């Protein structure tokens, strides 16, 4: 409710021999997908990805769709231009990605603006923090840079960022507010594993939480065991919630000297657990 953000993650991928380029626009409010345009569908239209966006009326969707189709055309031209810049064949598949948007403070004021491009997984060109100069990643990127400096693209972006982005984020934040503040606290438990040896594995689980941010630690009498712990990347359950686990290998018989700590924003206080052999 402090810092907030509105970002669009765009993808354009050439598919020579299989059809027209695949084009996608995906918008995020506080890292939450709220809208999506996908050109690989019927008669492609911008669509709500969160029920609170359904409040915006027909006008909104029609204008966002039209813009998306125009953006699609611009990216088709870009793919062609980059084959020229990099002297690449017309037969290979290539990817252009963009991250464009803004982040505001609790006061609604702009904290930071983004406009960054990438070609085949690598940075291409990005609008600096000042919102006036550009950072080119290679020689091809210098061409665009001269072109964009000449046209005053930086000024056009700063104008979108300080106004439209910022103003629309506020709109989005007041329709999605309650929804975006949603919290699902984790349910944790410890499992015990052993393969006939003098060591056991204790695995601390955190299930059903939202949002994804969470911290699991194993402690050996007050000391965090970061160096000897195994842990997975937080993953989606597929039902909207996330999962994660952290394990530790301890000597047989010393299970009760280890504690697992679960830190998550939905908890009144951090969870503390130990291996608990069933009744």
């Amino acid at each position: 409710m402090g810092p907030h953000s509105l970002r669009y993650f765009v993808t354009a991928v050439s598919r020579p021999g299989l059809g027209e380029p695949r084009y996608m626009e995906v918008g995020y409010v506080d890292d939450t997908e709220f809208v999506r345009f996908d050109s690989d569908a019927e008669n492609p239209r911008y669509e709500p990805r969160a029920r609170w966006m359904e409040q915006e009326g027909p006008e909104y969707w029609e204008r966002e769709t039209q813009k998306a189709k125009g953006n699609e055309q611009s990216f088709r031209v870009d793919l062609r231009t980059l084959l020229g810049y990099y002297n690449q064949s017309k037969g290979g598949s290539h990817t252009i990605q963009v991250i464009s948007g803004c982040e505001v403070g609790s006061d609604g004021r702009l904290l930071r603006g983004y406009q960054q491009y990438a070609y085949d997984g690598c940075d291409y060109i990005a609008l600096n923090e000042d919102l006036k100069t550009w950072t080119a990643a290679d020689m091809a990127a210098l061409i665009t840079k001269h072109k964009w400096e000449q046209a005053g693209e930086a000024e056009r972006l700063r104008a979108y960022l300080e106004g439209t982005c910022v103003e629309w984020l506020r709109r989005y934040l007041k329709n999605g507010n309650a929804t975006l503040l949603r919290t699902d606290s984790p349910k944790a438990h410890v499992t015990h594993h052993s393969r006939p040896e003098d060591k056991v594995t204790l695995r601390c689980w955190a299930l059903g939480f939202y949002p994804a941010d969470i911290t699991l630690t194993w402690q050996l009498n007050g000391e965090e065991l970061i160096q000897d712990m195994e842990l997975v990347e937080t993953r989606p359950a597929g039902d909207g919630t996330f999962q994660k686990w952290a394990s530790v290998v301890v000597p047989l018989g010393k299970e009760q000297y280890y504690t697992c700590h679960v830190y998550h924003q939905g908890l009144p206080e951090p969870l503390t657990l130990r291996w608990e052999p069933p009744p």
Binding site: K67, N71, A151, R156
Partner: peptide, 8 residues
Amino acid sequence: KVITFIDL
């Protein structure tokens, strides 16, 4: 609302 993209 997304910005309108120009040419590289």
